[PDB]
Amino acid sequence: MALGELKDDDFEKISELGAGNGGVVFKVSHKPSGLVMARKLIHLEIKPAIRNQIIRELQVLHECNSPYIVGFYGAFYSDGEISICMEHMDGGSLDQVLKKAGRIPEQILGKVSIAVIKGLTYLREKHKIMHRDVKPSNILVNSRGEIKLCDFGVSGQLIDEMANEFVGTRSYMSPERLQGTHYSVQSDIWSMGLSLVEMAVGRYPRPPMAIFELLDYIVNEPPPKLPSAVFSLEFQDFVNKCLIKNPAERADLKQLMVHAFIKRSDAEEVDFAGWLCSTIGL
Ligand SMILES: Nc1ncnc2c1ncn2[C@@H]1O[C@H](COP(=O)(O)OP(=O)(O)CP(=O)(O)O)[C@@H](O)[C@H]1O
Ligand SMILES: O=C(c1ccc(F)c(F)c1Nc1ccc(I)cc1F)N1CC(O)([C@@H]2CCCCN2)C1
Ligand SMILES: [Mg+2]
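A: This is the predicted complex of the input protein with EUI.
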């Protein structure tokens, strides 16, 4: 196998990259191969049986091979922290980009949609894996201008171990999913639409309100919409098609891949790498 032998003593911290909903992430050096990697440590609290299942289930990431999916190097258990080892991405996430930029322009977001559309299609068509948490911080970028999906739900047990410590991003869930319905394919698309709006407008796009009020608001009130003057009608339409509340009527990936917004975005020359430097200074 490419590495086979992954162990704690061989990595070497280059920096903390930050903390999320259950894991902490570092840029590391992998001494024995010279590979640069991101490494996410997740503390849990579980029987060596469960722990080792999780590590077995994660091995399926070795078979994810796509330019739109962050690359997998290995996963192992150590010092009560499970390790996911992945391609490092020197841009961080669109959520870090957004904080930096204020607001991410419609054209760059066209590039983002294409990558995301294609990321999900890959996962679903090759591996039958749903993402389950599409949101700006689970979308990564690098100086080579690339845009990739991470933190998707490969492991049914890890989802499980993560669900009864967190049902984390409640605010990004689809109305059907807040209602208790099982995860649809149609949920990733909702969450995508909502992420583009958020990056387009530069803020979580819902009236400010207390969290439990938010969850009723989402099931009960209409979906968000782009400000209808500053954004092209293609983009607005795109977004609205992702955000139909009724999952039977929401657009799917086959239909979004041929949308006027995507066609148009596809033909533009957007120097995203360059913009990333302009904006995040590498
Ligand atoms: N492969 C990678 N390369 C570079 N940075 C990464 C990375 N994977 C994660 N990060 C960054 O590390 C920080 C923490 O990641 P983490 O996934 O734990 O938090 P998050 O911000 O995505 C909330 P959640 O835990 O629900 O996904 C984030 O800024 C994330 O963008
Ligand atoms: O880190 C994860 C995550 C959750 C389930 C799972 F199977 C994973 F593999 C996870 N990590 C992961 C997957 C693919 C790659 I390439 C690299 C990875 F590190 N999550 C889900 C998450 O976004 C949080 C968990 C709490 C609920 C909301 N989302 C963070
Ligand atoms: Mg994440």
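Residues 17-23, 25, 38, 40, 70, 86-89, 92-93, 96, 137-138, 140, 150-151, 168-169 surround ACP (ligand 1) (CB under 6 Å). The longest helix spans residues 108-127.
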